[PDB]
RNA sequence: UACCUGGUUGAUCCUGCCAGUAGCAUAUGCUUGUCUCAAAGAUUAAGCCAUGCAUGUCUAAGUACGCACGGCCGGUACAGUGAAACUGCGAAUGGCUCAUUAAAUCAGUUAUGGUUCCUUUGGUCGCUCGCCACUUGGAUAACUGUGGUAAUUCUAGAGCUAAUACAUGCCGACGGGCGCUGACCCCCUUCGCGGGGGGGAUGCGUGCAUUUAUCAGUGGUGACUCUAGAUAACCUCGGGCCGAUCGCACGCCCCCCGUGGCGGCGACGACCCAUUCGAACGUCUGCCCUAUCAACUUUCGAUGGUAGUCGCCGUGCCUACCAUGGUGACCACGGGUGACGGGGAAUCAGGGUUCGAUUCCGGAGAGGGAGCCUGAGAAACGGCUACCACAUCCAAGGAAG
RNA sequence: GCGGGGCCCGAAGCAUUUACUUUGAAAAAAUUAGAGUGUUCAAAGCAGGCCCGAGCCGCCUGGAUACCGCAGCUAGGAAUA
C-alpha cells in the first residue's frame, strides 16, 4: 500500500516538503505538492501522473528524464521486470535481388512508468526515447494504447 | 585519432574552393575560426586563385605580412585565416573593397563593393540569451557577440553591425515576405522571397522560398539568411542576382555573348 | 655512478628517478627514468669523493684556502644590488652597478655592464 | 588502470565480445577517496580538460541547511549513523552521499535564541545566568517588542525534532558528493523523513 | 553488339558436362626502336634487421653580466649582431601496415536538455567597501674551476647570475549604496490606554566562479530540475580569477611646481561565457559461411529495481541490498573466414555475379601482453616502467634495444 | 483573429493503426555517365579566349548538370493488403 517500501527515502527531489507545520498548517488535512511536467510533440499527461503517489526517476512524467530523438512503437510481448517492460517492433526488410520482403523483428526492453495501469500482453504502446537508463533500456513509454478487451468476462 | 588534425588532403577539400587535382596532396587547411570549415574560404586561395595576386603559398604570405589585408576592418596576417560570407575584405592600398558572396552555383564570387558600404556587414543570429546580471546577448552567423541588442530581436533575426563600430544599426525581423539567401544545401546561391516558415516541432523546419521569376523551391530553415525588407536588398547582389539557370537556359546565354 | 643524498644504504640501487629529485637530468617533460644509483652512505669502493670545508683552522694550504677568485658576475637584479651595497633607499641603482674589465689583445680595452631587472 | 567501458560486459543475448581496441585513457583509473571523520585532508587530482577535483581523505566539519527556518552554518560532524547503500560503510565511519550523518547542536541553537529569543535544549533551568538571562530581555525597545511578540506563528517545532536539540546531537544527511568536490554540505533531516529514518536506526 | 562452335552414335533427337571463345589481373616465356602518362615486398613471414636520416622552433616586442662580434662614441645600466642555456609551444599531425575485429568496426540517420575542448575569433576583464606598490622573496641553468668512469643525449661537488620560470603580495577605484540588525520620535487612539510611520547610535554581510538548501516565476525551447533574479552560508595551503610582463613614436598639463601628474599603436598571459576544431558516448536500420553449432546467459553481473562509489558526463561502469529475469528456428549461443569497413573496381540487355591489403573517409596497431608520466589532447611507442620473445657493446663492474 | 455582426479562417481533434505510393528536404570529394576547351591529336588536364592602335589602372569567361540505394524526416493519395 505505502510508498515508502525501499531502505532510502524517496521522495522529488524538487518540491520542499515540511513547510513550517504549525496552529496554521495541521496535519489533519496533510497533502505534498506534486511535481509533473509536460513533455511536447502532442502527448498528453495521465491523470495518475498527477493525481498519483508514487515516485520514479526514470518517469517521463515526474522524472529528471527528458524524451527527445526517435519516436517508435511496438507490442508489450512480456510484463515482468519491475518498472520496466519489453515490446517488439516487428517490420519487413527487402530483399532487391528476390524482389520480395522479410518478415524480421528485434524486441527492446522500455521503461514502462507507472502512471498506466492496464498494460497488459499484447497491447499497443508508443515509445519515445531519451539518455540511458540501464544497461540495455534506452526508450521510455509515453502512451499506451490498449487492445485485446474493453470487456472480459 | 589520438588527437585533432591539422592537414588535409586536396580531393578531401570543399569543391566550391575549386582546386587543382595536379599540384599537390594537400589543401590549405583553413584555421579555426569564426566559421565552419566546410562552408568558408581561407585567404590564401582567395589571392592566388580568386585574384592571382600571387602564385605560390609564399607570395601569399610576403603581402599577408606587410599588414594590409583587413578581414572585417582588423589586420589578420595569418594565410590560412577562415573568411567565411558576408564578410568584407580591405586591401587598401589598391582599394578593390571585396565582399564574399556565393553566386548562384554554390561558388563563392569575387565581388567588388563602394568604400562607403563596404562599412558594414550583416549577421543572422544563432541564439539570444540572457547573461549574467540579468543582460541580454546574443551571438550571430559570425562568432561575433553583441550585448544590450534591441529586444525586438528574436532567433534567426538579421542584424546589421558596422564595422570599426561594433554595434548594431538596423535589424530586419525574419518575416513571411522578407527576401532571402540561401546559404545550404543543392540550392544555395539562390535568391528570392520568403513565401511560407512551416515549422516542425522536434524536426527540423522548412522554409518555402518563391524567387523574382516563379521558380519556387524550399530549403531548411538553418540555411536561410535574409537579406532583404520585402523586395529590396540591402547589399549589392553580383551578376546572375541569385537566379539559378537551366543547363540549356546557360548554354545560349553563353554562346550568344561569343558572338 | 654518483651519490645520491638519502638512500641510508651501502651498495648500489636503482631508483626510478623523475625530473628534479638528483643525478638525473630528463630529456623530454615528464619524463622518468629508472637508473642505477649509489648510496648515500661512504666505503671503500669509491673512485673519488667530494668534500667541502666548513672552517678555517689553523693555516694556509697552499693553493687551496688562499688565492680568493673574483666573483666577476655581480649582482643584477635591483634588489640584491640594493641589498649587496646597503642602499638604503632611491639611491640610484643605475650609478651603482658594477663593470667588468676586458683584457684581449687584438681589440681595445672594453668593458661591460648588464640591463636591469625589476 | 581501472577502466569503466562496456566493451567487456557480456552483451544483451549472453554473446561474449571480442575487444577490439586497447582500454583508452577515457576509461580513466577510478578508486574510492573513502572520505572519514578527524581532520581536514583534500587532495586534488587533475582530469581532462585540465581541470581539478578536490577528493576529499578526511573531513573535519560541513555546511549543513536548515530549510523550514531557512539556516545555513558551518558545524562539526559528530557520527555517521546509517547508510542505505551499505551497512558495513556505517561500521567503519565513511562518509558517503546519502549517508545520515550526526552533527551537534550548538550554531543552530544561537541562531534560534537570536532571532526569537526562547530558550531550546532546556529542560531543567536554573544555570542560565551567563548568555541566556540576558539574551531574552536585553532591554529592547518599543517596537522590538512589538515585532517579536508577533512571532509565537513560527516559533514552534514538531515534537521528534526539538527532542533531539534537548539531548546535544541532531541528526542530518549529506547532499554533497565528499571525494568529488571535497565539501560535505547537506540538509538537516526533519518531517515524515525523519520518521523514517528514525525507524531505519531504531531497528538496527 | 540481349550471339554461340567442337565432342557420347552406324547415323538421329536429347539430357548433360567437357573443350573452345572474350574480357582483366598476378607470375612467367620469347622479343623490344621512339614518345606521353605510370602501379611497384599486399598475398607466404604484423618474420628479423647492420648503417644513415625522417621534429624541431626567435620577433621591434620573456631571460645576454660567453670579447663570440661590434664605432666600448666616453667615463657610463644596456647602438645592436648574436652562439650557449633557461622559458614557452609543438613533438597526440603526417607517414606505414591490415594482424586483430561478424551488430563489433563501418555507412546513412538522429541526439547529448547526459559531457570535455591548447588554439582561433568575439565578449568579459575599477561590479568585491577590506608601515615595499615607484616593484617584494628565494633558488637555478649556460659560465668559471675541479672530477668519476671501458662505455650512453651518464653526470657529481663548489662559486656566480637572470624570468612571462618558481612563488608571496599592494595602491587606487572607495565617495558609498543595499539589506539583516539596531538606546530617543514624543506630532496617531497618551483618555488609564492601545499607538501608525520614517529616522538615526550600533555591529555584520556585500563581485564573478565553486557547494548546498530555500523563495519567486526577465529571456527561451515541443519540452527543465534551463537562463536570469532573491535569501541563508561555504570557498579545499598538492589553496579559482580580481595583470609586480615586454617593445614603438614620444607627447601633454604643468597651478604643488623643472619634479611630480596624464596620454597613442601594440605584444604577451588571463578565471568564465559563446564560437571553432573536434573528441567521446547514444538511437534507428543494414553484414559473409556453417545445425557434422539447438538451447544460451546468471557463484565470477546475467536482465531489471533502489542507494551510492568513483568517471569529464548518461549507465551493472562498479559496490551493497533486492526481484528472477534476458535471448532464441523471424537462426540465439558457438565455430570458420585466403573478414579491416565504406566510397568504389571488373563485368553488361534487364536481374545479377565477383573483387575491394592498395593513395579518399573511418577504425586498429607499432615484437607479444600490461601499467603509467607529461599535456587541452596519448594508456603515445622515432616517451617511460616491468614481464615474455629475439637481439647488441663490455675492460664482464654494467650499459643500450 | 477580416462578452456576444460583416467580404472570415487559424490554431484543435488526425476521430483505428500500418504496409503501399507520389512529393519535398537532407545527404564529402575522387570515380562513373556526361557540358565546355585543337593538351599539335589521343589518354588526360581544368584550363583558357581576344585585338596591344599601348594605356591594355588589360579585357571577356569557365572551373556545368545528373545519379547517391535501403532506413529515417516531411507533406499528399486511400485502390490493394
Redesign the interface.
Given at each position: 500500500a505505502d510508498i515508502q517500501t525501499e531502505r532510502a527515502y524517496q521522495k522529488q527531489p524538487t518540491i520542499f516538503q515540511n513547510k513550517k507545520r504549525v496552529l496554521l498548517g495541521e496535519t489533519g488535512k496533510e497533502k505534498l505538492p506534486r511535481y509533473y511536467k509536460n513533455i511536447?510533440?502532442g502527448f498528453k499527461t495521465p491523470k495518475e501522473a498527477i493525481e498519483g503517489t508514487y515516485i520514479d526517476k526514470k518517469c517521463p512524467f515526474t522524472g529528471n528524464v527528458s524524451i527527445?530523438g526517435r519516436i517508435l512503437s511496438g507490442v508489450v510481448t512480456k510484463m515482468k521486470m519491475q518498472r520496466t517492460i519489453v515490446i517488439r517492433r516487428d517490420y519487413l526488410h527487402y530483399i532487391r535481388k528476390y524482389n520480395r520482403f522479410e518478415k524480421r523483428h528485434k524486441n527492446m526492453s522500455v521503461h514502462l512508468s507507472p502512471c498506466f495501469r492496464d498494460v497488459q500482453i499484447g497491447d499497443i504502446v508508443t515509445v519515445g526515447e531519451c539518455r540511458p537508463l540501464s544497461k540495455t533500456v534506452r526508450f521510455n513509454v509515453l502512451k499506451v494504447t490498449k487492445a485485446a478487451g474493453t470487456k472480459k468476462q | 585519432a589520438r588527437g585533432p588534425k591539422k592537414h588535409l588532403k586536396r580531393v578531401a577539400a570543399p569543391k566550391h574552393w575549386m582546386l587543382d587535382k595536379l599540384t599537390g596532396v594537400f589543401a590549405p587547411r583553413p584555421s579555426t575560426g569564426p566559421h565552419k570549415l566546410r562552408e568558408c574560404l581561407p585567404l590564401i586561395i582567395f589571392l592566388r586563385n580568386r585574384l592571382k595576386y600571387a602564385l605560390t603559398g609564399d607570395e601569399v604570405k610576403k603581402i599577408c605580412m606587410q599588414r594590409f589585408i583587413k578581414i572585417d576592418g582588423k589586420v589578420r596576417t595569418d594565410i590560412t585565416y577562415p573568411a567565411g560570407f558576408m564578410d568584407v575584405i580591405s586591401i587598401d592600398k589598391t582599394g578593390e573593397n571585396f565582399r564574399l558572396i556565393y553566386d548562384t552555383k554554390g561558388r563563392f564570387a569575387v565581388h567588388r563593393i563602394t568604400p562607403e558600404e563596404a562599412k558594414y556587414k550583416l549577421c543572422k543570429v544563432r541564439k539570444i540569451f540572457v547573461g549574467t546580471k540579468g543582460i541580454p546577448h546574443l551571438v550571430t552567423h559570425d562568432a561575433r557577440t553583441i550585448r544590450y541588442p534591441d529586444p525586438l530581436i528574436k532567433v534567426n533575426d538579421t542584424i546589421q553591425i558596422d564595422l570599426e563600430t561594433g554595434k548594431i544599426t538596423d535589424f530586419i525581423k525574419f518575416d513571411t515576405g522578407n527576401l532571402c539567401m540561401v546559404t545550404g544545401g543543392a540550392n544555395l546561391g539562390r535568391i528570392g522571397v520568403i513565401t511560407n516558415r512551416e515549422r516542425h516541432?522536434?524536426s527540423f523546419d522548412v522554409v518555402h522560398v518563391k524567387d523574382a521569376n516563379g521558380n519556387s523551391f524550399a530549403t531548411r530553415l538553418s540555411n536561410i539568411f535574409v537579406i532583404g525588407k520585402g523586395n529590396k536588398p540591402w547589399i549589392s547582389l553580383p551578376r546572375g542576382k541569385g537566379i539559378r539557370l537551366t543547363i540549356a537556359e546557360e548554354r545560349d546565354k553563353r554562346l550568344a555573348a561569343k558572338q | 655512478f654518483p651519490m645520491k643524498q638519502g638512500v641510508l644504504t651501502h651498495g648500489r640501487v636503482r631508483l626510478l628517478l623523475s625530473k628534479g629529485h638528483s643525478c638525473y637530468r630528463p630529456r623530454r617533460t615528464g619524463e622518468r627514468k629508472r637508473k642505477s644509483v649509489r648510496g648515500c652512505i661512504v666505503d671503500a669502493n669509491l673512485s673519488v669523493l667530494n668534500l667541502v670545508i666548513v672552517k678555517k683552522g689553523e693555516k694556509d694550504i697552499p693553493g687551496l684556502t688562499d688565492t680568493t677568485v673574483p666573483r666577476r658576475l655581480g649582482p643584477k637584479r635591483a634588489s640584491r644590488i640594493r641589498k649587496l651595497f646597503n642602499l638604503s633607499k632611491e639611491d640610484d641603482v643605475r650609478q651603482y652597478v658594477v663593470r667588468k674589465p676586458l683584457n684581449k689583445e687584438g681589440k681595445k680595452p672594453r668593458t661591460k655592464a648588464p640591463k636591469i631587472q625589476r | 588502470g581501472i577502466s569503466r567501458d562496456n566493451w567487456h560486459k557480456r552483451r544483451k543475448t549472453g554473446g561474449k565480445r571480442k575487444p577490439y581496441h586497447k582500454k583508452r585513457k577515457y576509461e580513466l583509473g577510478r578508486p574510492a577517496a573513502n572520505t572519514k571523520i578527524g581532520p581536514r585532508r583534500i587532495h586534488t587530482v587533475r582530469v581532462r580538460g585540465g581541470n581539478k577535483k578536490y577528493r576529499a581523505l578526511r573531513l573535519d566539519v560541513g555546511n549543513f541547511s536548515w530549510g523550514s527556518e531557512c539556516c545555513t552554518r558551518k558545524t562539526r560532524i559528530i557520527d555517521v549513523v546509517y547508510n542505505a547503500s551499505n551497512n558495513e560503510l556505517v561500521r567503519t565511519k565513511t562518509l558517503v552521499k546519502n549517508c545520515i550523518v550526526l552533527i551537534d547542536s550548538t550554531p543552530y541553537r544561537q541562531w534560534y535564541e537570536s532571532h526569537y529569543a526562547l530558550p531550546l535544549g532546556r529542560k531543567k533551568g536554573a544555570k542560565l545566568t551567563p548568555e541566556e538571562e540576558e539574551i531574552l530581555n536585553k532591554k529592547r525597545s518599543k517596537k522590538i517588542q512589538k515585532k517579536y511578540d508577533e512571532r509565537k506563528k513560527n516559533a514552534k517545532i514538531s515534537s521528534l525534532l526539538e527532542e533531539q536539540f534537548q539531548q546535544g546531537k541532531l541528526l542530518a544527511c549529506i547532499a554533497s558528493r565528499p571525494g568529488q568536490c571535497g565539501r560535505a554540505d547537506g540538509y538537516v533531516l526533519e518531517g515524515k523523513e525523519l520518521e523514517f529514518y528514525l525507524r531505519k536506526i531504531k531497528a538496527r
Open positions: 511536447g510533440l527527445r | 516541432p522536434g | - | -
